[PDB]
């Protein structure tokens, strides 16, 4: 019955402070240790730290110079403040309830797990500037003996935000076409590639063009890809 | 990372599997392990706690055990719905909770297939912009999990590597891509660069050269 709900800005400018809050309902902060865990897109989980209902804290050493957490028992909420953010902090942030082992010596609470989790909120660290991509032709390599099959492609580099569409020869070429999902770089910009597998015999009689369109920036490029 | 897990495991539906979680005296050796199941797009879900205890709602076909400085998650009677990422975790002497890198569980619904790899060198156009990107396109593999390693000549390289998560293709196999960003001088200063993709213990590699 206890439910956790994150509340965050969504987008955050690099170097600025990321602030999140978690609201606990159908239960209370009282008597429990609470944590924030984050997961960059496509990557692993990283514990940020914990805070006891009374206010005592423990933070992951790798983030100690930039993090702090607080608690407001009156509203049954606890928060997170992460300073000097960069693209490395782009990730889904989850709040959770903790459990583990408690020692009465000095080790105090040892967080071994999280039984209750919020739904997570995506925090993107970016200027949010609309940027059109640069389009580079990926020329087919050299191959003898009839050449057999040839692979040509296009690199759609550094654009923001998603999405981007790619077609070949105005859509006339669909067989052998493979456009790959984009990669999100540490620069906060996206890049994707598209490749087409074609018969070698006609690399001289058939022109190949990758039609790239990044609608948010109104960037349209028709790049000819030819063997070198 | 502190806790280590195999990147992927798979079996046919109805079969059983185990997932290892390798730790050390600083974590598993002194603290109890918890496990989570995560379906992409949603939050992790507690499966096991205190090494082997199962919370209410989790079927008994999921089990956990700990021995020495390692732990194990066992799953019996695989169902398609069990496909997800599994993680182990516990407290480490470095004063923080640590998670294993995660294991992708695939419930075999088609024959395993090795990845096709295509590698492109930096374009002359990008080089004139004083940039260099090696593009490694990986497709038609199953299960959908691969590990990519890049070599500069015969030496390993980690800096500048960005690899996407595998995505399901229309034919139900998987695709992924890895990008290696280099300076024009790095590109021209090596005899060749290699993109090596490991899938199911087998490595498919491609090499390109500046010349």
């Amino acid at each position: 019955q206890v439910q956790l709900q994150e509340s965050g800005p969504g987008l955050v400018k690099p170097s600025e402070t990321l602030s999140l809050t978690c609201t606990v309902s159908g239960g209370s902060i009282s008597g429990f240790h609470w944590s924030w865990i984050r997961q960059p897109p496509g990557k692993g989980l990283e514990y940020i730290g914990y805070i006891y209902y009374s206010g005592s804290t423990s933070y992951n050493p790798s983030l100690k110079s930039r993090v702090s957490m607080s608690v407001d028992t009156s509203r049954n909420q606890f928060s997170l403040e992460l300073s000097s953010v960069t693209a490395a902090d782009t990730a889904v942030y989850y709040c959770a309830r903790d459990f583990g082992e408690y020692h009465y010596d000095g080790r105090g609470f040892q967080c071994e797990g999280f039984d209750l989790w919020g739904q997570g909120t995506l925090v993107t660290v970016s200027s949010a500037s609309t940027k059109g991509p640069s389009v580079f032709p990926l020329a087919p390599s050299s191959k003898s003996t009839s050449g057999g099959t040839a692979a040509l492609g296009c690199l759609v580099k550094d654009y923001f935000p998603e999405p981007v569409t790619v077609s070949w020869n105005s859509g006339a070429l669909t067989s052998g076409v493979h456009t790959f999902p984009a990669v999100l770089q540490s620069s906060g910009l996206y890049s994707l590639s598209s490749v087409v597998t074609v018969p070698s015999s006609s690399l001289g009689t058939q022109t190949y063009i990758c039609n790239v369109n990044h609608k948010p920036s109104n960037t349209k490029v028709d790049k000819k890809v030819e063997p070198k | 990372s502190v806790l280590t897990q195999p990147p992927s495991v798979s079996a046919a539906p109805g079969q059983k599997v185990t997932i290892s979680c390798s730790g050390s005296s600083s974590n598993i050796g002194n603290n109890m392990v918890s496990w989570y199941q995560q379906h992409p797009g949603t939050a992790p879900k507690l499966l096991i706690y205190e090494n082997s205890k199962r919370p209410s709602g989790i079927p008994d076909r999921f089990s956990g055990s700990r021995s020495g400085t390692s732990a194990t998650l066992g799953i019996i009677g695989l169902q398609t719905g069990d496909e997800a990422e599994y993680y182990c975790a516990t407290w480490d002497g470095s004063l923080r909770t640590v998670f294993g890198g995660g294991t992708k569980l695939t419930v075999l619904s088609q024959p395993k297939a090795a990845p096709s790899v295509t590698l492109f060198p930096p374009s002359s156009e990008e080089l004139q912009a004083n940039k260099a990107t090696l593009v490694c396109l990986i497709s038609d593999f199953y299960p959908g999990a691969v590990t990519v390693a890049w070599k500069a000549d015969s030496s390993p390289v980690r800096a500048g590597v960005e690899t996407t998560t595998p995505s399901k293709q229309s034919n139900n196999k998987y695709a992924a891509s890895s990008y290696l960003s280099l300076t024009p001088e790095q590109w021209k200063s090596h005899r060749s660069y290699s993109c090596q993709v490991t899938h199911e213990g087998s490595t498919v590699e491609k090499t390109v050269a500046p010349t």
Binding site: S54, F99, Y102, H103, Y104, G113 | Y49
Partner: peptide, 14 residues
Amino acid sequence: KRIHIGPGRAFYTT
């Protein structure tokens, strides 16, 4: 004194 705080177990220091 090694006390195990299981999932959902409210625990008070004071």
